[PDB]
Amino acid sequence: LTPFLILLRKTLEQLQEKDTGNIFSEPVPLSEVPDYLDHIKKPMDFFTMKQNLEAYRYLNFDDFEEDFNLIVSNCLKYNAKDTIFYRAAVRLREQGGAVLRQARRQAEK
Numbered sequence: 877l878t879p880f881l882i883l884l885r886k887t888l889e890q891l892q893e894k895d896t897g898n899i900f901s902e903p904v905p906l907s908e909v910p911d912y913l914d915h916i917k918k919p920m921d922f923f924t925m926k927q928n929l930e931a932y933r934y935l936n937f938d939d940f941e942e943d944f945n946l947i948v949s950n951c952l953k954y955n956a957k958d959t960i961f962y963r964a965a966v967r968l969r970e971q972g973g974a975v976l977r978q979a980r981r982q983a984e985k
C-alpha cells in the first residue's frame with residue numbers, strides 16, 4: 877500500500893505545515909510537564925505520528941485521523957482557553973480539517 881502511504885506522508889506534512897509554531901512537533905516532554913499524564917491519557921504529536929506512519933501502524937485513514945485528532949483534543953483539554961497553545965489547537969482543527977477532507981477525497985478518486 878504505497879499509493880496509500882504516499883498520500884498519508886504528504887497529508888502528514890501538510891498537517892505539520894499548519895503547525896506554524898512547532899507546538900505539536902514532538903511529545904509534550906513529561907519530565908518538564910510532570911502533571912501532563914494526570915489529565916492526558918493518550919499523548920500524541922507529529923514526530924510520534926511520523927514514526928507510526930513509517931513503521932506501518934496506520935493501515936487506514938481513520939486510524940491516522942484518530943491520532944491527529946488526539947493532538948488537537950489533548951491540547952484543548954490540558955491548556956486554559958486564554959493560552960497560545962489552546963488558540964493554536966483551535967486553528968489546527970480548522971486548518972487540518974480541510975487538509976484531511978481533501979486527502980480522503982483524493983483516496984476515493
Ligand SMILES: COc1ccccc1C(=O)Nc1cc2c(cc1N1CCNC[C@H]1C)n(C)c(=O)n2C
Nearest residue numbers: 898899900901902903904905908909951954955961
Ligand atoms: C520541548 O519542550 C520543552 C522544552 C523545555 C522545557 C519545556 C518544554 C515544554 O514543556 N514544551 C511544550 C509543552 C506543551 C506543548 C508543547 C511543548 N513544546 C513547545 C516547543 N516545541 C516542542 C513542544 C513539544 N503542548 C502542545 C502542550 O500542551 N504542552 C503542555
